[PDB]
């Protein structure tokens, strides 16, 4: 029996201490010490997520980068989107760690890993909506000045509502008997709020400034989506047939 309970940081230290002496001893030839337990398995579970967290961060970006290149068809535009993502992640990582250092709320490996990925993905989606609407205004022929106002008018409230929805959903995770779920709602809810504030403040500020410096945020494809016009038309005149196909897809998952 060792100090601390399963999942607690003290147990991880206790498992480390017991295993340390077990490793640092003159075991007889053939005989080897093997420290194993439920707490030990949980203790090493925390480390794996924390250790792999660096690799998860690297892969996530690499995927987004490539995706940003294809969608916007512009290297300069891709870097602008990435810049807002880094700031969003940096704010999310800081405040969650900031409050945790003062023992405001607990943190688990599942909580920490989910805080990082969610923040990065959410931030990327918010940026696309702002820029995507902005380039849509540019294709409509609006100048760089009126496009900015139209962009913020038609996306800020939607982004605001979407962020609260994500934050609100994570808030419900707190109302759980289990500790891991209960201790994960608060970190996620706070983390999402930072991104929404950052996306609605740093986002428009960057878009306002960068557009003034040459042809940077202006689109380049200037091409429609032939598929969408066909998809929408079918739903307008024959919604039942389209709905049945949607219903069929849901039933497939039920199998």
């Amino acid at each position: 029996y060792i100090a601390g309970d399963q999942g607690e940081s003290l147990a991880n230290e206790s498992v480390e201490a017991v295993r340390k002496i077990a490793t640092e001893r003159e075991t007889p030839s053939g005989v080897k010490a093997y420290v194993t337990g439920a707490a030990a398995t949980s203790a090493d579970q925390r480390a794996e997520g924390d250790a792999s967290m660096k690799l998860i961060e690297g892969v996530t970006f690499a995927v987004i980068t490539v995706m940003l290149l294809a969608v916007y068809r512009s290297v300069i535009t891709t870097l602008i989107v990435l810049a807002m993502v880094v700031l969003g992640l940096s704010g999310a990582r800081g405040i969650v760690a900031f409050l945790g250092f003062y023992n405001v709320f607990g943190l688990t490996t599942f909580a920490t890993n989910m805080v990082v990925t969610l923040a990065i993905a959410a931030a990327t989606d918010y940026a696309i909506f702002l820029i995507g609407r902005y380039q849509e205004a540019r294709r409509a022929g609006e100048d760089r000045e009126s496009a900015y106002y139209t962009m913020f008018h038609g996306t800020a409230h939607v982004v605001l509502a979407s962020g609260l929805t994500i934050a609100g959903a994570t808030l419900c995770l707190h109302f759980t008997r289990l500790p891991y779920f209960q201790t994960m709602g608060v970190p996620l809810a706070i983390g999402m709020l930072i991104v929404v504030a950052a996306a609605l403040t740093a986002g428009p500020a960057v878009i306002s400034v960068v557009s003034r410096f040459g042809k940077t945020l202006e689109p380049k494809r200037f091409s429609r989506s032939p598929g969408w016009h066909r998809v929408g038309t079918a739903t307008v005149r024959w919604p039942g047939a389209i709905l049945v196909c949607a219903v069929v897809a849901a039933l497939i998952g039920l199998l």
């Binding site: 005989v31 925390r46 607990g106 688990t108 920490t112």
Partner: protein, 81 residues
């Protein structure tokens, strides 16, 4: 007739960006990284209401051996008996 909020994000765009960079700079310098802080705040997965966790602790209390709920085992696996 521009709305105040987007206009404030445009006319004063430059100071707004600087503030966010300044805020982030404080957060990382003052407080250690997320991984370091997160390990300290590792909460126990065993719930308080869980009878099984209480039962193991209760055994230690009555037997006056321990008060925890986590125990490890050391196996001395040898080539020969």
């Amino acid at each position: 007739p521009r709305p105040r909020l987007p206009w404030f994000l445009r006319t004063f765009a430059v100071p707004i960006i600087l503030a966010w960079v300044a805020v982030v700079a404080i957060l990382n310098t003052v407080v250690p990284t997320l991984d370091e802080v997160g390990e300290m705040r590792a909460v126990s997965m065993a719930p308080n209401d869980a009878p099984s966790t209480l039962a193991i602790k209760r055994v230690g209390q009555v037997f006056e051996e321990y008060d925890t709920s986590s125990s490890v085992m050391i196996v001395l696996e040898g080539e020969e008996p």
